[PDB]
Each structure stands twice: as C-alpha cells, then as structure tokens.
Design a protein around this ligand. Sequence first.
Ligand code: ZN
Length: 257
Amino acid sequence: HWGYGKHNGPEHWHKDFPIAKGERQSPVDIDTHTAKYDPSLKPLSVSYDQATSLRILNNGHAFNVEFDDSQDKAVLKGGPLDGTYRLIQFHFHWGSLDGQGSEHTVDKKKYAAELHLVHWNTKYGDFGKAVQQPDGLAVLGIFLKVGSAKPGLQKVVDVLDSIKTKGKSADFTNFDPRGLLPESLDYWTYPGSLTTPPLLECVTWIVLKEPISVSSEQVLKFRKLNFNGEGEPEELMVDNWRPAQPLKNRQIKASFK
Ligand SMILES: [Zn+2]
C-alpha cells in the first residue's frame, strides 16, 4: 500500500522496503559544480527507429507506455553502458504545481515533471532477472518544463481520458518515443536505483542536461489522472515523485564540458 499520500508516501517506504535507506538510492540532486566531465564516456546511442509501442496502462502510481521488448527494436547503447539495453516502457513523474514534479534535481532546482525511458540489459534475458543485477537497467531521464507544447507528447495526452483510473489500459500502437527527446544528448550519469518500490539498486542512470518543454494544457491533462480505481473516491494523480536521496559514496559524471 505504498504511494504518495499523506500516510504512505516516500518517507514511509523504508518500513516495507528497507533498501529505501540503501547506499545507491535514486533520485539524487545533481550538483553541476561537483559533477565532473569524464572523457572515458561515450556518446549515447539511442536507436528507436524500430520501436513497437503496444499499450498504455494506469498502474495507480503513474502510467506506463509499454513496448515490445522481445527483439532489439528500441535499444540504448553507448554512453556509460556496456552491451545492449532494450526499451520496455516509459512513464513520467509530475507535480501538482509547475515548480515541482521532477525526481532528480539540478542544483536543487525542481522541474515540472520527469520522463523515464526504462531499458533492461539483454545479457540477463528478461526484465525480472535484470532488476536483480547491479547493471540490469539503464534509465534515460528527461526533465520537463512548462512552456511551449511538445508535439510528440500530444498522442499520449489525448489517450489519458481512456485510462483515467488505476487498472485501465488502452491500445497504444505506433507511438514514436523519439518525439520526446530534446535536441542534445549531453548527460549526467551515476549508479542508482528504481525510484518506486521495490527500490532495487539495479540502474545506470543517464539524465539528459537539456529539458523538453510541454504546454500548460498538456501538464493540466496529466493532473486529471487518478490514483484510485473506477468507482472509488477521486484522488488526483499528482505529486507522484520521490525526493532526492543522499548521494553517499557515489560520483556523478558528465558527458560534456
Ligand atoms: Zn520513474
């Protein structure tokens, strides 16, 4: 019964998931004055031309746009990564107000929302085995600010009414996730965790420096989603973000000077 409410939010998660107080928890604050350029990094390779989206699902915590991950169709490689990571889903975290909603922060700045493109390392055969490994996942994180509309997000926004409540899903084929990326692929990277229970420490984070802009109308439609199931009291799906966690014995590396 974890969530983001008044009595089950992030500060309670440790009771059922003790790794919430672990050594490699996410998100973190990205201090641009201490992150160091790493010349050993590569450019990222984002290969989404063959991506096959399937479905969108309201899981009661966010919504996931799900992909066919049974072949190397949409993969992330390069950067800090060894091997090939397949896109399984993306989702967002967002606020009730434009001044909060992101999970990572940059010099303590909160963005309006954050996009997570979740990928798993093909050497481990399936997602569920990957999350048991320190290098099982690679999550591409992208900040959202409110400004101009993002055209490539509109198809997502216009299906949200069909998945208002927990447990609803809808067909979601032929969505191109390239329409969610900013121009630059400059990034910060560090080792961390899933940001929801079970909070497993299996993630290579790759957080893009350049945010994307979404419109106030787009964000407002996200804020009409519900945490609750149909026929239950309405609880708006807002403020579904975990705050920054202690960096501990980690370094954040930058791909750019
Ligand atoms: Zn996430």
